[PDB]
């Protein structure tokens, strides 16, 4: 209930709204107050968390959804577990990673994504879900070293038996920096659920690139950089990414030092298998989880 939560400090702000660190029965919680322009994302997330009952150790822990009316308006709240280490985008800028730390991050993200993509059968079984806005800022680092995926506002679901696709009704567009080439060229088949899984794998390979750069190998480490930092400006436009990803067919550069570390070699091969211009040639989330497990 929103009445029992004490908003203590704002840890994030954007077009989506605000994220607050709050107290609730003597424990820290995360409260997202949605903006009026992003109401459809609150409905979709409430559906995925309350109706679909999405629950996984590598997905942001749902607590409660609520609506509070004040100042002649009604705010839409989402209350989840609070991770004091912040987003993966924040965490990668404060520390370097070793082999275990890197693999724990990338395997946890892969297992959480595979849980979204894999349909659980039986009655009231979880359908296959695509995130469609996967990025380092939508990934949070837990104190055990593992990560969890957040923001289900753009989720899309599908069930194999009925062959029915639920795209929702959200005017929100995904993050342009992480957009797949089929999205930028407007060739993506919006009626096929596999299309939405393949744009997640594409974006997953970009987060994979961000994390691998922070793994120290032979006293060498790369500074943190967002994908395509050296070709697009801040807040890139649609034409900015299309020129890089589609026209020039550019991908993030694999540092040569990665070939001197066996873990980074298998990781560099993994992200390359997520960046195919042909969406059907990209790996599945299950194959990525399997490949990461054998490493
Ligand atoms: C409640 O709904 C959400 C909460 C969080 C969340 C959860 N737990 C911690 C944080 C966040 C938001 C962003 O990251 C943080 C960052 C910081 N700090 C570092 C940078 N600046 C100083 C403060 C502190 C806490 C968090 C995420 C969501 O999706 C991106 C949410 O919606 C689905
Ligand atoms: N952040």
Swiss-Prot record:
The residues covered by the Protein kinase domain are 5-295
Give residues annotated as binding ATP: 11-19, 32
Q: What does this protein do?
A: Bone morphogenetic protein (BMP) type I receptor that is involved in a wide variety of biological processes, including bone, heart, cartilage, nervous, and reproductive system development and regulation. As a type I receptor, forms heterotetrameric receptor complexes with the type II receptors AMHR2, ACVR2A or ACVR2B. Upon binding of ligands such as BMP7 or GDF2/BMP9 to the heteromeric complexes, type II receptors transphosphorylate ACVR1 intracellular domain. In turn, ACVR1 kinase domain is activated and subsequently phosphorylates SMAD1/5/8 proteins that transduce the signal.
Family membership noted in the UniProt record: Belongs to the protein kinase superfamily. TKL Ser/Thr protein kinase family. TGFB receptor subfamily.
Picking any one GO molecular function of the record gives: ATP binding
Q: Name one GO biological process term.
A: embryonic heart tube morphogenesis
Q: What is this protein called?
A: Activin receptor type-1
- Identify the tissues in which this protein is expressed: Expressed in normal parenchymal cells, endothelial cells, fibroblasts and tumor-derived epithelial cells.
Query: What topology in the membrane does the UniProt record assign?
Result: Single-pass type I membrane protein
Q: How does it assemble?
A: Interacts with FKBP1A. Interacts with FCHO1. Interacts with CLU. Interacts with type II receptors AMHR2 and ACVR2A. Interacts with BMP7. Interacts with GDF2/BMP9. Interacts with BMP6 (when glycosylated); the interaction may induce HAMP expression. Interacts with TSC22D1/TSC-22.
Q: Looking at the keywords, is Thylakoid present?
A: no
Q: Name the predominant localization.
A: membrane
- Residues of the whole record sequence present: 204 to 498 of 509
Q: Which reaction does it catalyse?
A: L-threonyl-[receptor-protein] + ATP = O-phospho-L-threonyl-[receptor-protein] + ADP + H(+); L-seryl-[receptor-protein] + ATP = O-phospho-L-seryl-[receptor-protein] + ADP + H(+)
Where is it localised?
Membrane
Q: Which UniProt keywords apply?
A: ATP-binding, Disease variant, Glycoprotein, Kinase, Magnesium, Manganese, Membrane, Metal-binding, Nucleotide-binding, Phosphoprotein, Receptor, Serine/threonine-protein kinase, Signal, Transferase, Transmembrane, Transmembrane helix
Q: What is the effect of changing residue 153 to D?
A: In FOP; variant phenotype
Q: Which cofactor does it need?
A: Mg(2+); Mn(2+)
Q: Where is the active site?
A: 133 (proton acceptor)
**The UniProt record lists the keyword ATP-binding:** yes
Q: GO CC terms for this protein?
A: activin receptor complex; apical part of cell; BMP receptor complex; plasma membrane
